[PDB]
Every structure is written in structure tokens, then in C-alpha cells.
Ligand binder design. Structure first.
Ligand code: HEC
Ligand code: HEC
Ligand code: HEC
Ligand code: HEC
Ligand SMILES: [Ca+2]
Ligand SMILES: [Ca+2]
Ligand SMILES: [Ca+2]
Ligand SMILES: [Ca+2]
Ligand SMILES: [Ca+2]
Ligand SMILES: [Ca+2]
Ligand SMILES: [Cl-]
Ligand SMILES: [Mg+2]
Ligand SMILES: [Xe]
Ligand SMILES: [Xe]
Ligand SMILES: [Zn+2]
Lengths: 314, 352, 768
């Protein structure tokens, strides 16, 4: 016969999501500069709005298609329309998001708007997504606030790569003082301690690490140049469609907001555009300018591997 | 209980998973936010108990005899062994990061646990007699989401959901040998939530999404950003990999998750989490399409938005967030676990 | 009940489900609104559809219970097209008041009070509907904007009535069928521009009606009629569009069911415009969508201009041939104006023998069911039942209307003309692969003249269509080219079905086939892919339009990305040529005025014009309407023919190019010269829509003339069986320079017209 629902077994208590109410205008979304007071009763509704694909236009996808359902990321790299075309952005890792404003990637430099870059509130991130990404109806104030409540409630997972004893390993501790070496100078933009729970390993500032993607004629030119050296001599196709990550790009800004190093093991494809395919690539001076991110040039393979192992421990 | 990834408390169970005893008398529901497993009598459809397990179970598997339940505790990084008759957890074995799934061997002598940690690639094997982890099978890439065992019992597939990767693959393991024979890549795929076998073991089904990453984000129409797909892979050496659409032109199935295979392999059941519904497909029409089409023709047909209506049996209304589905041994009933609605939808199938 | 998706409880629907919520919010139907029309050719001019002004008609309210009828429109000379509001206590319609003013849009409470005039326009207005934008809930919304480098602040509030989408035509214009009307969709601010000001932060740009406290903006620029708008489940506008462009669809054209955004940002086909589909030249009108099974149900008329006919249906979720149904569906009569109810019932206007009435529809018997109301003296149609309508989701608009864009960064409205200094509104568009198509190699202009791969397409020609406007009735004649390829659709202006056109400009194509360009906005246009000789391999026959600041993407060339298929994942060079600069809206190159070639006439590059004029990093070109170039036969071609051709080509040596610009009388009509009549002459055994002996409209590469001018086999389509004579052959390739030859090429690709300058001009032509 024809498939149908005969009955529904209710195991737990009944739960219904927030209603439609009145959608916000884009100016109303921009009208929220700073966060609203946290409400832990709205977090589940926010989780629903996060995982729901039905609110979208035809039901293509949801927030969970990018940021996963773990509230982490899929590592998918996209081209958004507010920052310019040809400018790629690695999908943000959203665990422990409230601890390090401003938001997104691009920092205060080149962004007086504090919306696209140097985002003042999480509201200006998700709230815009209906019209600038999903291309669907805007969120009501309540549902938006609930969503932001869900985002702010996300906490770090912690690194699996350290001993059950809770301590570090000899390789991780070997890499720790390479990390904290004053000449290497990772502590400068990434201050923090491994066993300190409140350590964010970020200065929450805007720096130039030489990861800005420019054109062949320089900044604000076209077309882009290959920033991946290893991939360049590898003979990889710049416009190739089968690459996990773009080896080219055109950025509107040279500087970016520094991300946390916490749960960096769980971010696939690091930096802003997803230039670095492995942790090692954030070090070896392949996808960035020489010694513009730390000074690693004097280091050799063993030290670098130890440093990677220490990064995995964060 | 805690909402996943948060320190915020909730009283709601939030079922993430569902399965059924081989005798079909009992449903075992994994409660993610309840940190326990709900037992439901299939006949009377009411709750016979709630067994406490370790924290945030995302999965469970039943022994062939049905005397034990192996539950996957994701955040505890462990696996709970539960006595079904006693309604009590008799052990905790600890495994690699984030088991998202576990399956019992046909002989019931072995349990395979997929460790889904982003930087973690492992399948941990567990002897049922020792009730302990034996060894670990390293996959070809990171983050296996789920495994499945052949009716043959000599082969084990693992869907590898790999962060920061457009091409996401499936690993084939020889159980007697215990390592990777072959790795088959699904191109332009993401978010693989499940893998199932056909009763004859000649095919495997995998639910996932196809992003277009290399394109501007402009409209929502014609799946410009995301399309939703089910892929059928022929287990034959050099077999076809067929990516097929789950979507209409103006109607899409958001984030397909769970899958249930008809015992005789007539129908395929797909939990659709985003659109809160169960998509039922005709497997003889699907496999018929696979056998009668070349690789090129199938690759072209992946983007056909009218194709579904050929093999689509039904789309059945469900509760909110049906992340998992399961079938009765007679295949006459399909149960769907709804997270947000905190319940289970019972569906009468086409089988009579 | 859950329809598209499951709800919060079993048996109930989520608020995201339009169909289900429509089912739950409907309520019992007691009273219905419908149009009664006098029975006359003039009283019920459904043969003139889309242009319909049923003079003498009235709108009435009927009770299904007490069975007593009341006329609400008594103060109007003519009234029709009723559409109820969301609450159902008021409704909007079209008609002309006894006081005059022409046919306009009005709204009135259903009790018969509170009449308001929503439109004062020069032209005719029709079929208004309510689209709720910024208004989901009843009340006042707040207006907020940015302070011109300040903060975001609140200024005032506005009662939320939403907007009104309607179809209307200007005065003294002609469509591509030479009918004296051209219909297009308009969005209307009910509060006088402050609804848009609530959504955008600037009032609606367009034509303002301060006396009526309203404002209108044209969202659809198609040269033919777009009519009968309605609501999609996903919150867009469903309507019928006439694609008449050139010789397409066997020189007939098709009426297609299609959707577009309420600002007209993203028009796309639903069903009926493409080859292999069902219904042929049948007219498709009055389309609506069923709530239960989600099926688009429309009136399929046997004649394209007819508003009465049978009833057919296609799935909304999957609008393809497999889901096509003919609802009614046999005996014996005619159907019109179907209205599907959320409870799955339907109201149709049915005539068994000769006279329409309101009838419930029976889906089991595939015909009209029990009778609701019929007067014998009136034709009863357009049933509009009274119930509660669930508001579909409103989509964000990036345009404030005419000349006004809204930035993707700060989201602030800006005037491209008055402020930024641009001569005209300008958008952009990008095609990721121009070589990618679902069309085969064939003789017809919408098909490929030859196989083309990446690198084979050098550039693209962008062509703007010109509306046909002829104030002087003595200087214009329809059917002057009846003996030529055009047939009945020909005129004094052209011997083909192609009306007057001009070249927006050329744009280069990357080696991967991708191309992107900046061009004029709010104007009808289409494009042609070009080979290394600069000839059109394939022509897109349709009218595209861009709203200001709006970009438009497509995967391929009629590939299915905007029709039946998912977007193909493509990494394209043009993507990086689109917007790379912080200080710019678009960094994409504007359309170039000319093309430059090498010695032998192969494509070298694109050449700037004299029309070149800090929000873009590229030279601004082709935004001046007065300077827009076209190719006129009399001004451009005929002199070349007189100088280098007419010499040894006379009556004895066909074709006859002699006689200069002197008109030739054919069937008592003097329109074109001798050379034009000769070159446009049809060929036995050849479809006139493909071309004639020496000329194929909108294909130069398929034209025998061009074949002889380049002395080579240009395409895979042979114009005739014997092209080059065996003896007495004379090579024509050295007779012309590249400029003249490519001028002929441009002339032919443009549709090979005669008068390309709109309106009466000083150049020779028809006169009486
Ligand atoms: C000015 C550039 C023109 C154009 C547009 C055409 N001609 Fe000629 N022509 C001449 C001769 C002797 C022939 C017949 C022999 C042969 O075709 O090689 C033609 C033929 C044509 C055709 C083909 C007609 C058909 O096959 O039906 C066409 C389309 C054409 N011509 C156009 C002679 C001359 C000549 C010297 C006496 C000159 C100068 C031109 N032609 C110029 C032109
Ligand atoms: C200030 C100049 C910095 C120094 C010194 C170090 N880091 Fe950094 N880090 C900085 C920026 C501005 C960014 C982002 C740049 C971009 O284009 O996105 C980063 C990023 C990282 C990351 C990846 C984070 C992520 O992708 O989310 C890692 C793993 C990282 N940095 C590690 C790291 C190490 C090992 C350093 C010493 C060699 C170091 N950082 C120094 C800013 C700065
Ligand atoms: C190659 C020339 C192209 C390119 C680069 C684009 N289109 Fe499409 N187009 C094309 C053909 C051959 C046709 C049909 C012509 C006929 O006589 O039938 C069309 C038609 C359309 C339509 C009408 C609806 C339909 O036929 O499906 C629309 C709408 C349309 N074209 C839009 C469109 C868009 C958004 C494009 C991206 C830039 C685009 N066209 C490119 C051929 C071609
Ligand atoms: C709510 C909600 C969020 N997401 Fe978004 N996301 C995506 C990208 C490519 C980026 C980075 C853009 C840039 O760097 O310019 C982001 C960023 C965020 C952030 C910022 C986190 C931080 O630490 O700064 C948040 C909180 C966020 N996003 C929330 C990609 C995507 C998607 C793919 C197109 C989609 C569907 C998505 N994000 C959805 C959502 C949300 C649902 C409304
Ligand atoms: Ca971008
Ligand atoms: Ca930050
Ligand atoms: Ca990342
Ligand atoms: Ca873990
Ligand atoms: Ca009647
Ligand atoms: Ca003229
Ligand atoms: Cl296309
Ligand atoms: Mg859109
Ligand atoms: Xe459904
Ligand atoms: Xe077009
Ligand atoms: Zn078409």
C-alpha cells in the first residue's frame, strides 16, 4: 500500500520551537551592535534554528551544512558576496566563539563598517545570513537572539592527543618551548598556557602575517597569483576544480583577526582562505610570506614536527 | 542532561539514534541530551525503562541473540556494554575519539566502532567474550562517521567524513585480514551521515550533500550552493559509483542522515533531518537505473532535478530532526527518531 | 496538516510550511467574490488577452448560503480581477471609474466601503495581488537607517500593509506581434514609499503618485507582455511571460509559466518555453498552485491570445513533462479562472454551452461539479473565495527601485545616476561556461551552427532590443515584408520577425569559456557567443534584464542551470575578474563598442568607443543611450552595396543590388529597396525562420552571402545543395574590407532589419 504515519511514540517531554512572528529588516539587524544579555533558556531553540533547513527558501541546506551539527565546522571553503568575488573564506570554527571578539576573519583594517570584517556582534553574522547567504526570509528578533544564545553557549572540546593522566607528552612539551621561544615569538599574538582552561591563545587583534592574497600586479589587481609554493612547483592547476583548497585568491584586505589555537586540531584547512592544508603549512612558510607568521626559517624538521604536535595538544 | 557542546542543562532526552532487536520486539533509543538509552516495547509501543550510560551516547548496536546492547558514548570517548534483560550497564570499554557508530559481526563475536574525531582515524575492534578493545584499524583518511558489515561478514565499509575536503571517500576492509583493501572516493561530497548494505551485498548506499564550493554564493535556486544526494556504489571490483539526486527543482531534502534498508532490498528509507521527513525510495528502480546507465550518464543524471520522481516512492511527515531510522525484521514498519520533538514516528511501509 | 515538511506535532504543520499553514489557517468558506461580464465581443474580450478590459463588467459578492448577491462596484464603469487581502476583509482589483481616469488599480473593503485609488498611470493596469514585504504581522514597523560615518538610528514608523504586484502597459506602444500593448510587472508601495524605506532605508524609486500616496517600480523589462502574477510557496511571484523574440519557436513564440522575485532580480522559466515540452503554441494564463498535492494549475487556451480554454496542471516541485496533466479534460465546453482552495477543493468558471458560471470542480470526474451561481444574462468568471490567506515569506531586496542599488557591505541605498554620476543604471552578469549547452548542432538560430569547445568562443555580442513606437501612422505599415522571411510578423521596419535592435557591446571570453561584464540595467537585452571570425555561433532568444547594481549568474548557455538542472561546479577565470577592489561596486569591464581584427579578418581583440566616461576601477562605456550604436541597412549597408556591389549585379546577374535606396512596390506596398528585397528573398524548401536564399536572420555564419564573402564553409549547416558554382566562379573575398564585411555580418546577426532607428526618421521608408 501507500506509506503513512499510524502513530507517534513520545519518549520524552513535548517540545515546540519558536514561532514565525515578525522578521527583522536588514537595518534592524545592523541596528544590533552588541550582544543581548545571555539567556540559557533560549539555547535549544537556537540549536533548532541552527539545524533547521525548513526555514530556508526551498529547503536546500542549513547552518549545520557548514558549521556541522557539532558546532565546529565542515572545513568547506566558500566565496561570499560581501567581501568581493575571488576572495575565499574558510568556514569558521564556532566552538568558544564568544570568548574572542570581533568576529569573522577580516579585522578592523579596511573595515569601518564593523559588519563584514571586525564584526561587533554575533547577531550581525547570523542575522545577515538569511539575506546574504540562504536568500530566504529574515529571522525574528526572538529566533535570532536564541540562535546567538546557542552560539555563545558553545565550548571547546579539548585535545584528544594528550595523556589520560591529563599531562602532556614529551613531544608536545618539546614543541611547547619552541612555541614559546622569544625569537620564534608565537606567544606574541597567541598568548596562553596549555593547562590553563581560560587560555584563548589569541590577542584578539588585527595583524599582518603575510597571508593576504593579492594579484599578479599586486594589491587590488587581477588575476590572482599562486600563494602556495609547494603546490606551484607541484604543477597544480590554479583554476583546478578538484582541489580541496584554492591555491589562488584576491583579498580586499591584507590583515585579519587572529583565531584561537584551541581545538586547532579540529579545524580542517587553516588560516582565513583555507590556504594551509595542514598545521605544518602554517609554519613552514609555504602559504605565507617569509617569517611574517612567526620566525620559523631557522628551525628544521624535527622542531617543526614537535611544534605541530604541541599545536595538536591545544 | 547537557545540550551537546554546551554546559547548559536540559531535561529533554533529545534522541540522536534508534535501532531494533533482531527479533524485532524491542527498540533501543540513544538519548544524546539524556545521557541514557530508552527501551521501547515494539508491540505495546510504550517505554519499558531507561538505562543510564556514559555521557552523550550517539549510537547503539544489538547482539544477534539480543542479550546485550553496545552503546557509543561520544564525549566519554567510550562504549558502554549494557545488559538488556537486567536493564543495567555491565561494562565500559574505552576507545578512540568520538565513536559515532558501532556494529556487531554476524557471528556476534566482534564489535566494530567507528571513531569520528576530526583528526582521528580509527576503527576499534572489540571482542564480545573479553568485552574489551582488541586492536585498531587505521582508515585511509580522518573522521570515519559510521561502519557497516556485509551479509558475507568478510568485509567492512567505513564512510570517511573528512573536514576540509571536497572529495570524501569510503574504505573497504577485509575483516579476516583487518586492513584496507581499497578506497573509493565520492567526488564533490560532504557530510556523509550513513552507509548501508543491500541484502545481496552487491551495493552500498551513502547519504550526503554535494556543495558547489567553486561558485559564488548568489541565489538558492537550482541547488546553486547545496544539493542533497544519495550515492550507490557497486561492491564489485571496479564497480560504478553513482551519485543520485534526492531533490526536486523547488523541493529539497535538507541534510539526509539515517538510512534503513528493506530486508529483501525493495525499498530504501532515508531520514531527512533538515526537512523533518522520511524519504522512501524504490531500490529496484534505483539499481535498475544504475545497471542500465554508464558512468558518464549517471554523472550527468546527478544534476537532473526531475529524476527523483522516477524512483521516489514517498516523502512521509515526521517529527523535528529525524536524525536516524530503523526497520522491523519483516520490513513492514519504519521508526524515525526525532531529536527536537523528543519522540519516535512510526510508519507503515508499502510492504504488505 | 503537514505538506512540504513535518510539523511540531503529528497532524499539524510548521510555520515554515506555506501549504500546510494555508490549510490550517483557511477556515470555512461562506462568501465569494467574482466578476460578472456583459456577454459581447466587447464585453468579454478574452481574445485580446493579456489585454483585457471587459467594458461594462462588475465585481459582485455572493453568499453560498443565503444565496443573495450584492454589487460592490456600482460606482465603476468597469471592474474586474478581484484579489482578496490576507484577512479577507478587503480586496484589490482593476477597473475604470465612471468619473474617468482610465483603467487603474483600486482597493476596497468587502463590505463595499473604503474605496482607494492605488494607481494613476498613462496606460492600462490589471490583475493586482498583495505581496507582503516587511509585513508578516498586523501593526506598525519601525524605520531605521545609517546617518551618512555615523550609527544606525530609528526614524519614525509605518503601518505595515505590504506591497502590491500588478501587470500594466504604457500608452502608444507595440509588442513583438504589433499589438498595441506591452505588459510588464510593477511593484507598488501602499504607504507611499515608506514600506521600501522600512525594508531598505530609502523610499521607493520609480514613478511617484503623491496624491494617491503610492509609488510604483517596474520589475520586469520584457518587450512582450508579462501578465497574471500570483504567489509561489517559497515567496516569489508566479506569472505568464510572452517570449516572442525574433523568429524563435517557429516564428510564433510561446507563452510560458515562469517565476521572478518581487523586485524582478531573478527571472527563471518554470514550464512551457522550451523545445520538447507540451502545449506548443497554446496560450497559458491564470496560473495558480494547489496546496495539497502542490500542482500548478493553469488555463491552456488553443489560441495564444485567448483567455478561455482547457485546464492543465504540472507539479510545482518538479515542473517537467512527466508531471504534466490535462485536468479538463474533455466535454463539452470551456474553462477559465481556476481557484484552488487550501482544503483541496477548487472553484472554476465553466461554460457547458456558451455561458460561463461559477462551479465547484470535480477531480474524480475530471470536469465541473455542482453549480455555485450562474446568471444567464451574465458571464460569470474569476471566482475569488473569502478566506484567510497565509503570507508567503518575503525576500530581501537589494534595489530601492529605479537607479537605486543597495550595497552588499553596509546595506545602504545609493543612486547610480543622480549621485554617483553614471549616465545610466548599470548591472553585471557572468556565464561560467559559454560553450556548455543542452542544444544540438542545427540550422535554427537558438542552436549551435558548429561544434565549439573552450577557446573556440573568443567573445560575446550583447544586443539591446528597442520597443516599437510609431506615432505617425502614415510612415509605418505592418506586413510590408509579407513576401520576405518575416511573413505576417514583418513590417516597414524589417523584412524579418526581428524588430528594431542595437548593439550594447562586445565582451571578451576567457580561454575556459567563462565571461563576465558590466552593462546597462532596466533594459531588455540578450547575447550571442562569437567565434574567431566574430560571428554568432548560437543566439539566446529571450529578453534578459538587470536591476541596478544587480549581478546575474549562469552555469552555461541554456545548460539547464536556470531551468531543469543543478548548477555545475565550475572554477572560472571570470570570477576573479568580477569584483576585486574595496573601493568599487564592480570591477568587471564594461561592454566594448567595437572589435578589432587581423589582416585576414580573424578576431584580435575588443576596441573601446568614444562613449567612455570612482566606484569602479574600469572605464565606463556604453551607458549613454543616445550614443548606442546600431546597424541600419539604409545608412550603413546600402552605401557599401552601391559602391562595391551594384556595379556588376543587375537584373541579369542575381541577386539584384542596383537601384540605390529607391523603394520597390510589392503587392501595392513600397517599403524596402531592390537590394533588400533581393537579399531577403525566401528559398524553396527552406524554413523562412531559418533564413532565405542569401540571408539567415540572427545567423551570419549560416548565411549564403557571408559564405561567399569569406569564400569558405563557415558552418555545419549548408544553406543549399549547390553553394559554389563549378564554372564561372568569381572569388568575392577581396571585394570588401574587414569593416564593410563585418558590418554586413553585424547587420545579419542583428536580425537583418531595414529601419533600425525607432520612430519616423529622415531615411527612406514607407509613406502614404
Ligand atoms: C559586393 C561585395 C558583392 C556582393 C555582396 C555580391 N557580389 Fe557577386 N557575383 C559575380 C559573379 C560573376 C557571380 C556568379 C559566379 C559566382 O557566384 O562565383 C556572383 C555571385 C554572387 C553571389 C551568389 C549568388 C548565388 O549563388 O545565388 C552573391 C551572394 C553575390 N555575388 C554577392 C560578380 C561580381 C562582381 C564583378 C562583376 C562584383 C564586383 C560582385 N559580384 C560583387 C558582389
Ligand atoms: C602576529 C604577527 C602572529 C604571530 C607572531 C603568530 N601568529 Fe598565528 N595567527 C596570526 C594571524 C593574523 C592568523 C590568521 C591569519 C589568516 O590569514 O587567517 C593566525 C593564525 C594561526 C593559525 C590558524 C588559525 C586558524 O586557521 O583558525 C595557527 C595554527 C597559528 N596561527 C599558529 C601560530 C604559530 C605556530 C606561531 C609561531 C610560529 C604563530 N601562530 C605566530 C597571528 C600571529
Ligand atoms: C549562449 C548563447 C547562452 C548564454 C551564455 C545564456 N543563455 Fe539563456 N538562452 C539561450 C538559448 C539558446 C535560449 C532559448 C532560446 C529559444 O529560442 O528557445 C535561452 C533562453 C533563456 C531564458 C528563457 C527561458 C528558457 O528558455 O529556459 C532565460 C530566462 C535565460 N535564457 C536566462 C539566461 C541567464 C540567467 C543566463 C546567465 C548569463 C543566460 N541565459 C546565458 C542561450 C544562452
Ligand atoms: C548562525 C550561523 C553561522 N553560520 Fe557561518 N560562516 C561561513 C563562512 C565562510 C564564515 C567566515 C566568513 C568570513 O570569514 O568572512 C562564517 C562565519 C561565521 C561565524 C564567525 C565565527 C567566528 O569565530 O568569527 C559565525 C558565528 C557563523 N558563521 C554562524 C559559512 C557558512 C555557511 C556556508 C554558506 C552557512 C550555511 C553558514 N555559515 C551558516 C551560519 C549560520 C546560520 C544562519
Ligand atoms: Ca568572497
Ligand atoms: Ca575574533
Ligand atoms: Ca578552518
Ligand atoms: Ca573525544
Ligand atoms: Ca453565467
Ligand atoms: Ca524609423
Ligand atoms: Cl545554464
Ligand atoms: Mg535571489
Ligand atoms: Xe512531508
Ligand atoms: Xe540571455
Ligand atoms: Zn529554453
Amino acid at each position: 500500500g501507500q506509506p503513512r504515519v499510524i502513530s507517534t511514540i513520545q519518549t520524552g517531554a513535548t517540545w515546540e520551537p519558536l514561532g514565525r512572528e515578525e522578521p527583522l529588516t536588514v537595518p534592524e539587524v545592523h541596528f544590533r551592535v552588541k550582544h543581548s544579555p545571555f539567556k540559557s533558556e533560549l539555547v535549544r531553540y537556537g540549536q533548532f534554528q541552527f539545524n533547521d533547513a525548513a526555514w530556508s527558501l526551498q529547503g536546500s541546506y542549513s547552518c549545520a551544512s557548514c558549521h556541522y551539527e557539532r558546532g565546529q565546522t565542515t572545513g568547506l571553503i566558500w566565496d561570499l558576496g560581501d567581501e568581493g568575488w575571488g576572495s575565499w573564506k574558510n568556514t569558521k570554527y564556532i566552538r568558544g566563539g564568544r570568548y574572542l571578539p570581533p568576529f569573522r576573519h577580516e579585522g578592523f583594517t579596511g573595515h569601518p563598517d564593523e559588519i563584514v570584517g571586525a564584526t561587533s556582534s554575533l547577531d550581525r553574522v547570523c542575522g545577515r545570513d538569511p539575506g546574504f547567504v540562504f536568500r530566504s526570509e529574515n529571522f525574528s528578533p526572538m529566533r535570532l537572539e536564541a540562535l546567538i544564545c546557542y552560539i555563545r553557549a558553545l565550548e571547546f572540546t579539548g585535545s584528544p592527543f594528550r595523556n589520560a593522566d591529563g599531562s602532556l607528552t614529551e613531544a608536545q612539551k618539546r614543541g611547547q618551548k619552541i612555541f614559546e621561544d622569544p625569537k620564534v615569538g608565537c606567544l606574541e599574538c597567541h598568548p596562553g598556557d596549555p593547562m590553563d582552561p581560560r587560555a584563548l591563545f589569541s590577542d584578539a587583534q588585527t595583524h599582518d602575517v603575510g597571508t593576504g592574497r593579492v594579484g599578479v600586479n599586486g594589491f587590488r589587481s587581477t588575476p590572482g597569483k599562486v600563494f602556495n609554493i609547494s603546490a606551484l612547483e607541484a604543477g597544480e592547476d590554479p583554476y583546478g576544480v578538484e582541489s580541496n583548497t584554492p591555491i589562488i585568491g584576491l583579498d580586499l584586505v591584507k590583515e585579519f583577526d587572529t583565531p584561537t589555537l584551541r581545538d586547532i586540531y579540529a579545524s580542517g584547512t587553516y588560516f582565513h582562505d583555507g590556504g594551509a592544508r595542514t598545521l605544518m603549512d602554517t609554519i613552514n612558510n609555504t602559504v605565507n610570506d617569509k617569517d611574517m607568521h612567526g620566525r620559523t626559517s631557522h628551525l628544521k624538521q624535527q622542531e617543526l614536527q614537535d611544534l605541530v604536535e604541541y599545536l595538536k595538544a591545544l | 542532561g547537557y545540550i551537546q557542546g554546551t554546559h547548559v542543562k536540559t531535561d529533554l532526552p533529545g534522541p540522536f539514534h534508534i535501532t531494533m532487536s533482531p527479533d524485532g520486539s524491542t527498540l533501543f533509543i540513544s538519548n544524546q541530551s539524556g545521557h541514557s538509552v530508552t527501551f521501547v516495547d515494539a508491540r505495546t509501543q510504550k517505554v519499558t525503562g531507561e538505562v543510564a550510560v556514559r555521557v552523550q551516547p550517539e549510537a547503539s548496536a544489538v547482539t544477534p541473540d539480543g542479550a546485550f546492547l553496545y552503546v557509543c558514548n561520544a564525549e566519554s570517548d567510550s562504549v558502554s556494554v549494557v545488559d538488556i534483560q537486567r536493564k543495567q550497564e555491565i561494562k565500559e570499554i574505552k576507545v578512540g575519539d568520538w565513536p559515532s557508530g558501532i556494529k556487531i559481526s554476524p557471528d556476534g563475536k566482534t564489535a566494530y566502532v567507528a571513531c569520528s574525531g576530526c583528526m582521528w582515524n580509527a576503527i576499534d575492534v572489540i571482542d564480545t567474550g573479553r568485552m574489551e578493545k582488541v586492536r585498531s584499524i587505521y582508515t585511509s583518511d580522518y573522521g570515519p562517521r559510521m561502519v557497516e558489515i556485509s551479509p558475507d561478514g568478510k568485509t567492512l565499509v567505513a564512510i570517511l567524513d573528512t573536514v576540509g575536503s571536497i572529495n570524501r571517500s569510503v574504505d573497504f576492509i577485509d575483516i579476516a585480514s583487518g586492513r584496507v583493501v581499497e578506497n573509493r572516493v565520492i567526488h564533490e561530497s560532504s557530510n556523509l551521515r550513513d552507509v548501508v548494505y543491500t541484502p545481496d551485498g552487491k551495493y552500498i548506499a551513502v547519504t550526503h550533500q554535494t556543495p558547489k564550493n567553486w561558485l559564488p554564493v548568489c541565489e538558492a535556486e537550482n541547488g546553486q550552493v547545496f544539493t542533497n544526494n544519495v550515492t550507490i556504489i557497486e561492491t564489485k571490483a571496479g564497480g560504478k559509483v553513482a551519485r543520485l539526486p534526492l531533490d526536486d527543482l523547488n523541493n529539497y531534502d535538507g541534510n539526509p542522515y539515517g538510512m534503513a534498508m528493506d530486508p529483501k532490498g525493495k525499498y530504501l528509507y532515508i531520514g531527512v533531518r533538515g526537512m523533518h521527513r522520511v524519504t522512501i525510495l524504490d531500490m529496484d528502480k534505483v539499481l535498475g537505473l544504475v545497471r542500465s546507465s554508464t558512468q558518464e550518464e549517471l554523472d550527468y543524471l546527478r544534476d537532473d532535478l526531475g529524476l527523483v520522481r522516477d524512483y521516489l516512492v514517498a516523502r512521509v511527515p515526521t517529527g523535528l530532526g529525524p536524525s536516524s531510522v530503523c526497520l522491523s525484521p519483516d520490513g513492514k514498519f519504519c521508526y524515525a527518531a526525532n531529536y527536537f520533538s523528543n519522540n519516535v514516528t512510526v510508519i507503515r511501509t508499502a510492504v504488505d | 496538516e503537514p505538506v512540504m515538511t513535518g510539523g511540531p506535532v503529528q497532524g499539524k504543520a510548521l510555520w515554515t510550511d506555506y501549504s500546510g499553514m494555508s490549510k490550517e489557517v483557511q477556515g470555512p468558506v461562506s462568501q465569494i467574490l467574482f466578476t460578472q461580464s456583459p456577454r459581447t465581443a466587447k464585453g468579454d474580450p478574452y481574445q485580446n488577452y493579456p489585454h483585457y478590459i471587459p467594458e461594462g463588467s462588475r465585481i459582485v459578492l455572493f453568499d453560498l448560503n443565503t444565496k443573495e448577491l450584492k454589487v460592490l462596484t456600482n460606482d465603476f464603469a468597469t471592474a474586474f480581477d478581484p484579489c482578496t487581502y490576507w484577512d479577507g476583509k478587503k480586496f484589490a482589483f482593476a477597473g475604470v471609474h465612471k468619473k474617468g481616469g482610465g483603467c487603474q488599480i483600486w482597493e476596497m473593503n468587502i463590505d463595499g466601503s473604503g474605496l482607494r485609488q492605488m494607481t494613476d498611470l498613462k496606460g492600462t493596469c490589471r490583475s493586482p495581488i498583495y505581496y507582503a514585504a516587511g509585513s508578516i504581522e498586523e501593526g506598525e514597523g519601525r524605520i531605521i537607517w545609517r546617518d551618512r560615518e555615523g550609527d544606525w538610528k530609528e526614524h519614525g514608523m509605518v503601518e505595515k500593509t505590504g506591497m502590491i504586484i500588478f501587470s500594466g502597459s504604457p500608452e502608444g506602444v507595440m509588442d513583438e506581434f504589433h499589438n498595441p500593448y506591452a505588459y510588464n510587472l510593477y511593484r507598488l508601495d501602499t504607504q507611499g514609499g515608506k514600506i521600501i524605506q522600512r525594508i531598505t532605508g530609502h523610499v521607493l524609486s520609480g514613478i511617484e503618485f503623491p496624491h494617491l500616496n503610492t509609488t510604483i517600480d517596474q520589475i520586469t523589462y520584457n518587450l512582450s507582455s508579462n501578465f497574471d502574477p500570483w504567489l509561489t510557496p517559497d515567496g516569489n511571484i508566479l506569472f505568464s511571460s510572452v517570449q516572442a523574440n525574433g523568429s524563435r519557436a517557429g516564428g510564433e513564440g510561446r507563452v510560458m509559466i515562469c517565476v521572478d522575485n518581487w523586485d524582478g532580480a531573478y527571472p527563471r522559466p518554470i514550464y512551457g518555453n522550451c523545445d520538447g515540452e507540451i502545449g506548443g503554441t497554446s496560450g497559458r494564463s491564470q496560473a495558480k498552485i494547489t496546496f495539497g498535492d502542490r500542482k500548478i494549475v493553469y488555463v491552456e487556451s488553443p489560441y495564444m491570445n485567448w483567455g478561455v480554454g482547457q485546464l492543465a496542471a504540472v507539479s510545482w516541485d518538479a515542473p517537467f513533462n512527466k508531471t504534466y496533466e490535462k485536468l479538463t479534460g474533455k466535454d463539452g465546453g470551456l474553462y477559465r479562472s481556476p481557484y484552488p482552495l487550501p482544503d483541496d477543493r477548487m472553484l472554476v468558471s465553466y461554460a457547458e454551452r456558451g455561458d460561463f458560471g461559477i462551479y465547484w470542480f470535480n477531480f474524480s470526474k475530471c470536469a465541473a461539479g455542482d453549480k455555485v451561481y450562474d446568471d444567464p444574462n451574465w458571464n460569470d468568471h474569476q471566482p475569488a473565495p473569502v478566506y484567510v490567506k497565509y503570507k508567503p515569506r518575503w525576500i530581501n531586496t537589494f534595489t530601492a527601485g529605479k537607479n537605486f542599488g543597495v550595497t552588499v557591505v553596509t546595506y545602504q541605498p545609493f543612486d547610480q545616476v543622480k549621485v554617483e554620476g553614471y549616465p545610466h543604471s548599470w548591472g553585471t552578469w557572468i556565464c561560467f561556461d559559454t560553450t556548455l549547452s543542452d542544444q544540438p548542432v542545427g540550422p535554427y538560430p537558438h542552436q549551435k551552427a558548429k561544434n565549439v569547445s573552450h577557446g573556440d568562443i573568443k567573445a560575446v555580442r550583447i544586443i539591446q532590443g528597442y520597443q516599437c513606437v510609431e506615432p505617425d501612422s502614415t510612415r509605418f505599415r505592418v506586413g510590408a515584408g509579407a513576401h520576405l522571411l518575416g511573413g505576417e510578423r514583418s513590417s516597414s521596419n524589417s523584412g524579418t520577425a526581428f524588430q528594431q535592435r542595437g548593439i550594447i557591446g562586445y565582451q571578451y571570453v576567457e580561454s575556459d569559456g567563462s565571461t563576465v561584464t558590466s552593462q546597462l540595467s532596466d533594459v531588455p537585452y540578450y547575447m550571442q557567443i562569437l567565434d574567431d571570425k566574430g560571428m554568432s555561433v548560437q543566439t539566446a532568444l529571450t529578453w534578459a534584464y538587470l536591476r541596478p547594481y544587480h549581478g546575474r549568474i549562469c552555469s552555461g548557455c541554456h545548460y539547464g542551470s536556470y531551468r531543469g538542472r543543478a548548477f555545475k561546479n565550475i572554477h572560472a577565470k571570470a570570477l576573479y575578474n568580477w569584483w576585486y577592489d574595496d573601493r568599487s561596486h564592480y570591477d568587471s569591464p564594461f561592454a566594448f563598442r567595437y572589435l578589432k581584427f587581423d589582416n585576414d579578418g580573424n578576431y584580435k581583440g575588443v576596441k573601446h568607443g568614444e562613449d567612455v566616461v570612482g566606484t569602479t576601477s574600469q572605464p565606463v562605456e556604453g551607458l549613454t543611450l543616445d550614443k548606442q550604436r546600431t546597424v541600419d541597412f539604409r545608412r550603413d549597408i546600402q552605401p557599401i552595396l552601391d559602391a562595391k556591389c551594384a556595379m556588376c549585379h543587375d537584373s541579369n546577374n542575381p541577386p539584384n543590388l542596383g537601384g540605390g535606396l529607391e523603394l520597390v512596390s510589392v503587392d501595392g506596398i513600397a517599403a524596402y529597396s531592390r537590394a533588400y528585397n533581393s537579399l531577403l528573398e525566401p528559398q524553396r524548401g527552406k524554413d523562412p525562420n531559418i533564413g532565405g536564399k542569401y540571408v539567415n536572420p540572427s545567423a551570419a555564419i549560416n548565411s549564403l552571402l557571408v559564405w561567399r564573402l569569406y569564400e569558405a564553409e563557415l558552418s555545419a549547416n549548408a544553406p543549399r545543395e549547390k553553394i559554389f558554382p563549378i564554372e564561372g566562379r568569381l572569388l568575392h573575398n577581396k571585394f570588401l574590407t574587414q569593416d564593410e564585411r563585418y558590418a554586413i555580418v553585424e547587420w545579419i546577426d542583428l536580425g537583418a532589419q531595414w529601419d533600425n532607428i525607432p520612430g519616423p526618421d529622415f531615411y527612406p521608408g514607407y509613406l502614404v
